[PDB]
Design an enzyme around this catalytic site. Structure first.
Site, PDB file in Angstrom:
ATOM      1  CG  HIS A 118      80.115  -3.285 106.096  1.00 27.58           C
ATOM      2  ND1 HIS A 118      81.000  -3.878 106.929  1.00 27.58           N
ATOM      3  CD2 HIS A 118      80.637  -2.813 105.039  1.00 27.58           C
ATOM      4  CE1 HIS A 118      82.361  -3.572 106.355  1.00 27.58           C
ATOM      5  NE2 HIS A 118      81.906  -3.052 105.275  1.00 27.58           N
ATOM      6  CG  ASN A 290      87.706  -1.066 110.032  1.00 30.52           C
ATOM      7  OD1 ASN A 290      87.675  -1.957 110.683  1.00 30.52           O
ATOM      8  ND2 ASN A 290      86.655  -0.868 108.946  1.00 30.52           N
ATOM      9  CE1 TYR A 292      92.422  -2.656 104.989  1.00 32.34           C
ATOM     10  CE2 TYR A 292      91.148  -1.164 105.869  1.00 32.34           C
ATOM     11  CZ  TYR A 292      91.018  -2.367 105.574  1.00 32.34           C
ATOM     12  OH  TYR A 292      90.187  -3.078 105.441  1.00 32.34           O
ATOM     13  CD  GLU A 361      87.405  -3.732 107.272  1.00 32.11           C
ATOM     14  OE1 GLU A 361      88.012  -2.995 106.484  1.00 32.11           O
ATOM     15  OE2 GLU A 361      85.972  -3.367 107.325  1.00 32.11           O
TER      16      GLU A 361
END
Length: 456
Positions: A118, A290, A292, A361
């Site tokens: 990461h 992930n 968003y 995420e």
């Protein structure tokens, strides 16, 4: 609206962002250590030195997860904590810390998803060229092995690199993430390196841990034409998605890079050794997502600049009609709209033959303040997660995307990179003075979701 049987509910944190103590008990220096500690890089000069002190407070933290009763945790191993010289002599103090964390997790019943990488390359490997040297594939594999042979037995669910795009373009294209280079070649070379690194990473997973899941985690914000009536925009919106995320998934699921990227990037974009293709093709067990936000995308008259990494499109917040993608958050770029989350999950599915998907995420950041009652009333963050856990059901139910788990970014407020501490993604508030933890309202909110296994 109950979810499939055994749908994993998790929370994700990541080494550098919460741990603190980047140097203790034998740890090497990371490229993030380096970068945050240089003038100019990070909002208010913030670094990852102290952060959430999670290094000292993991027992407390896992406990904050236990009370919340959240079936899973995603977290990183810090590379320079396991191999400070990046390579060779393995640190036992490093393992000590993690094998502990794990053992605890399993004792109290929480499921561990470990991120092998990461963003903290050992400064050691950076001096050697870092993620730019072809040699990363050897390094990476070497590292993965140490982890598989020490943790394989207790950790079923692995993630190799997190968000490679970020590594690549912010890190060698625009120079806003570590190491901060600004080529117009290096991003592509680095991207390529990560996929073969991913490949070598996974082949050994398959040799050593013949009982577990492993994949890459890719970010990517869904797109909408700026003018729906104009086929240019509808192409642009799709091209953008290709440059954003098909860049890593088409090799992984399909064998090569997108034709659009090839058309534009020419020889800046490496070709695959057939020996390479054999490592990379079908090399993730699940599609790690992930997600968003989303944007309107408008096409462009002019050809693309050498500098370009997006696919020669305008990335916007308003379309032709004057409509707007969604409202503000703390993050100036991240606007909510859950349509985009559904849409994105379908996009993937159609494109990669309905893979099993872990949304590794999802989350939002607002300016949380502790109320006089001591509670943290983040309504907007509940609102966010509602909409998105919302869209995800619709995707599962109707379009039949095979989602399999969902993690919130993030358990704790953390070091949010070039942005420092200035941005909160926690389901749990952390005053950085006292390292006190207040479970944000949306923390109890997600508790209900988890427990009820769906949105009430």
């Amino acid at each position: 609206k109950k979810f499939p049987e055994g749908f994993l509910w998790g929370v994700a944190t990541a080494s550098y962002q919460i741990e603190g103590s980047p140097l203790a008990d034998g740890a090497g220096m990371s490229i993030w250590h380096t970068f945050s500690h240089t003038p100019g890089n990070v909002k208010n000069g913030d670094t990852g030195d102290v952060a959430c002190d999670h290094y000292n407070r993991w027992k407390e933290d896992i406990e904050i997860i236990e009370k919340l009763g959240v079936k899973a945790y995603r977290f990183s191993i810090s590379w320079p904590r396991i191999l400070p010289e990046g390579t060779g002599r393995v640190n036992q103090k490093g393992l000590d810390f993690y094998n502990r964390i794990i053992d605890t997790l399993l004792e109290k019943g929480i499921t561990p998803f470990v991120t092998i990488f990461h963003w903290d390359l050992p400064f050691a490997l950076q001096l050697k060229g870092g993620l730019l040297n072809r040699e990363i594939a050897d390094w990476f594999a070497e590292y993965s092995r140490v982890l598989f042979e020490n943790f394989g037995d207790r950790v079923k669910n692995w993630i190799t690199f997190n968000e490679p795009l970020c590594s690549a373009i912010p890190g060698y294209g625009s120079g806003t993430f570590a190491p901060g280079r600004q080529s117009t070649s290096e991003p592509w070379t680095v991207g390529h390196n990560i996929l073969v690194a991913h490949g070598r990473a996974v082949k050994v997973f398959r040799e050593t841990v013949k009982d577990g899941k492993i994949g890459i985690v890719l970010n990517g914000d869904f797109t909408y034409p700026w003018d729906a009536a104009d086929p240019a925009d509808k192409e642009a919106a799709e091209r953008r998605l290709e440059f954003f995320t098909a860049w890593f998934a088409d090799p992984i699921y399909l064998g090569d890079y997108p034709a659009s990227m090839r058309k534009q990037l020419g020889d800046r974009l490496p070709t695959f050794t057939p020996e390479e293709r054999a490592l990379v093709h079908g090399s993730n067990d699940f599609y790690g997502m992930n997600h968003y936000t989303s944007n309107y995308i408008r096409h462009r008259s002019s050809p693309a600049s050498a500098d370009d990494t997006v696919g020669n499109v305008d990335v916007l917040f308003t379309n032709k009609q004057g409509n707007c993608i969604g409202p503000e958050t703390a993050m100036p770029w991240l606007r909510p709209c859950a349509a985009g989350f559904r849409d994105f999950l379908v996009w993937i599915s159609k494109r990669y033959g309905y893979p099993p998907i872990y949304v590794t995420e999802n989350g939002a950041a607002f300016d949380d303040v502790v109320s006089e009652d001591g509670r943290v009333h983040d309504q907007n963050r509940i609102d966010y997660l509602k909409a998105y856990i919302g869209a995800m059901v619709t995707a599962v139910e109707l379009d039949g995307v095979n989602v399999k788990g969902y993690f919130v970014w993030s358990l704790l407020d953390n070091f949010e990179w070039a942005e420092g501490y200035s941005k909160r993604f926690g389901i749990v508030y952390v005053d950085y003075s006292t390292q006190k933890r207040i479970v944000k309202d949306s923390g109890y909110w997600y508790s209900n979701v988890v427990k009820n296994n769906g949105l009430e």
